[PDB]
Amino acid sequence: EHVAFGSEDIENTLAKMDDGQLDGLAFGAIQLDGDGNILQYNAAEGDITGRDPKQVIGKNFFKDVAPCTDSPEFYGKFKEGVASGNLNTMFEYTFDYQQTPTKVKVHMKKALSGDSYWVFVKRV
From the list 8, 5, 15, 20, the residue with the least C-alpha distance to 107 is: 5
Cβ atoms of 10 and 120 within 8 Å: the answer is yes
DSSP 36-91: -BEEEE-HHHHHHH---TTTSTTSBIIIII-GGG-SIIIIIHHHHHHHHT--EEEE
Stretch that binds ligand HC4, among 6-14, 17-25, 43-51, 76-84 (CB under 6 A): 43-51
57 binding ligand HC4? (CB under 6 A)? no
Strand, coil or helix: 109:
strand
66 binding ligand HC4? (CB under 6 A)? yes
49 binding ligand HC4? (CB under 6 A)? yes
39 binding ligand HC4? (CB under 6 A)? no
State which residue, 13 or 68, has the beta carbon closest to ligand HC4: 68
From the list 99, 61, 65, 101, the residue with the least C-alpha distance to 78 is: 61
68 binding ligand HC4? (CB under 6 A)? yes
Number of residue whose CB is nearest ligand HC4: 68
Minimum CB separation from ligand HC4 for residue 71, in Å? 9
97 binding ligand HC4? (CB under 6 A)? yes
Interface contacts to ligand HC4, rule CB under 6 A: 30, 45, 49, 51, 65-69, 95, 97
